[PDB]
Design an enzyme around this catalytic site. Structure first.
Site, PDB file in Angstrom:
ATOM      1  CB  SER A  58       3.359  -4.071  -5.410  1.00  0.00           C
ATOM      2  OG  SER A  58       2.337  -4.509  -6.296  1.00  0.00           O
ATOM      3  CG  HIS A 108      -1.804  -4.522  -3.776  1.00  0.00           C
ATOM      4  ND1 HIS A 108      -1.565  -3.247  -3.311  1.00  0.00           N
ATOM      5  CD2 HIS A 108      -0.588  -5.065  -4.018  1.00  0.00           C
ATOM      6  CE1 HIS A 108      -0.263  -3.033  -3.261  1.00  0.00           C
ATOM      7  NE2 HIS A 108       0.352  -4.122  -3.684  1.00  0.00           N
TER       8      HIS A 108
END
Length: 302
Positions: free
Chosen positions: A92, A195
């Site tokens: 991430s 996301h």
């Protein structure tokens, strides 16, 4: 041989996380330079600030990248890994640090880019009431299928039986109300559905910031959360990084790729999280090292 360098993402930050690193020579000075680039008092944020104040995505993202690079900087200083082949990967927000580790972007630009990613996503979390919830165990097919049924995205695919669902809090609640058999659902303490398309409004700012940063082709094999495959050019890497803003983190595919290579050791940078453990499961027999203190940047050589 090959050493896997893993950069952690959100959820690992903790108060005083930078304290043990600001002792190194040049540390305090670098944090000052990075605090300027990110227009954030990273010094107080990583030392005195409360775990609660730092859990703010606009802060934890650059703070986490800052902690990661301080360690990398020192690791670079002692040349402990000079001469050894590595494969880099981040989870991430950790990808920004991974990019800097792999030489795609400068550390100061990485932290500032991370700060932009945080401020922009924070903004996006306000346009819709979204969140993320870890879903552990359960029958994979049934869990994934259930997620689609509820308009939830498997924003994180971390390992078999280890997924993170994301979407409107509304859908996350219906998930927790009737979880698939054997699956444990735990809402994560995040401001939004990272996301996923819900972060879409953060793209413009993040994309603009990235397009103005000086880049270079990676100096090492750099994997992407997009599909666990390496990004071989500066442009490919940056375009993928920007796009990952609204795309699922395929950490499972990244570790699968590590297996493909001859990874002989795993090193997870601070703030050490769970990447080492996840990576162990597929790379059995491979020793891992959790860097949480400068007193660890030594063993890495041997």
């Amino acid at each position: 041989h090959m050493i896997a360098l893993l950069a952690p993402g959100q959820g690992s930050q903790t108060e005083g996380m930078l304290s043990p690193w600001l002792q190194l020579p040049g540390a305090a000075d670098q944090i000052a330079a990075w605090s300027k680039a990110a227009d954030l008092d990273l010094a107080r944020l990583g030392t005195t600030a409360s775990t609660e104040e730092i859990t703010d995505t606009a802060v934890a993202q650059p703070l986490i990248v800052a902690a990661t690079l301080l360690a990398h900087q020192e690791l670079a200083r002692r040349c402990v890994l000079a001469g050894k082949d590595v494969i880099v990967a981040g989870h991430s927000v950790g990808e920004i640090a991974a990019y800097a580790i792999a030489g795609v972007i400068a550390a100061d630009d990485a932290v500032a880019l991370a700060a932009t990613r945080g401020a922009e996503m924070a903004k996006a979390c306000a346009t819709e009431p979204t969140g993320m919830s870890a879903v552990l165990g359960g029958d994979e097919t049934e869990v994934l299928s259930r997620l689609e049924q509820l308009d939830l995205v498997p924003a994180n695919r971390n390992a078999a039986g280890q997924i993170v669902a994301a979407g409107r809090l509304t859908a996350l609640e219906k998930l927790a109300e009737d979880p698939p058999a054997k699956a444990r659902v735990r809402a994560l303490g995040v401001a939004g559905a990272f996301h996923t398309e819900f972060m879409a409004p953060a793209l413009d700012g993040f994309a603009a910031a990235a397009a103005n940063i000086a880049t270079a082709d990676p100096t090492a094999t750099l994997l992407s959360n997009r599909d666990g495959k390496p990004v071989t050019s500066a442009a490919a890497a940056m375009d993928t990084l920007v796009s990952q803003l609204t795309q699922p983190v395929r950490w499972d595919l990244c570790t699968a790729t590590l297996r493909e290579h001859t990874v002989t050791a795993i090193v997870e940078f601070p703030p050490a999280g769970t990447l080492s453990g996840i990576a162990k499961r597929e790379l059995r027999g491979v020793p891992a090292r959790a860097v949480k203190s400068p007193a660890d940047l030594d063993e890495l050589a041997n």
